[PDB]
Symmetry: C5
Subunit: 38 residues, 5 copies
């Protein structure tokens, strides 16, 4: 009922989650941009 | 009155919040850039 | 004197702080790039 | 068995981990883009 | 010997650290890209 259950397994979620997004932006941009320019 | 109430529900806010921004930058840039180039 | 005072109000700082930066990069880049290309 | 073991060494993982990604996006994009444009 | 020493001063490291990187990517990209295009 009380708060403070787990944090170790939580902080890992955001860390790995941001990696997936930060990759999509650099890879997706390169594909769309490279196709337009070239 | 004392601090330390909840952290689990907090760390999730930033995680999901950054996802929305990191997406807007890659999608918004692609739209404006692709239109200019093409 | 002892550590562990507040974390809830802290984690919110980085969350909102990153939003301001991630916006400047997408908006600033679009302005400089769009002007050069167009 | 109980939760809450370590957080100091954890928060450092994401901090340093994001640095490696945020660098790959700016360096990788510059290489692919600069080659196409030039 | 036991864990849990400080977190307030830690969470601030990543917050300020990411700012320095997120700036280098937008400023470095603008310099290299603007020079190539223009």
């Amino acid at each position: 009922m009380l708060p403070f259950v787990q944090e170790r397994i939580g902080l890992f979620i955001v860390n790995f989650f941001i990696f997936t997004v930060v990759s999509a932006i650099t890879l997706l941009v390169s594909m769309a941009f490279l196709t337009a320019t070239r």
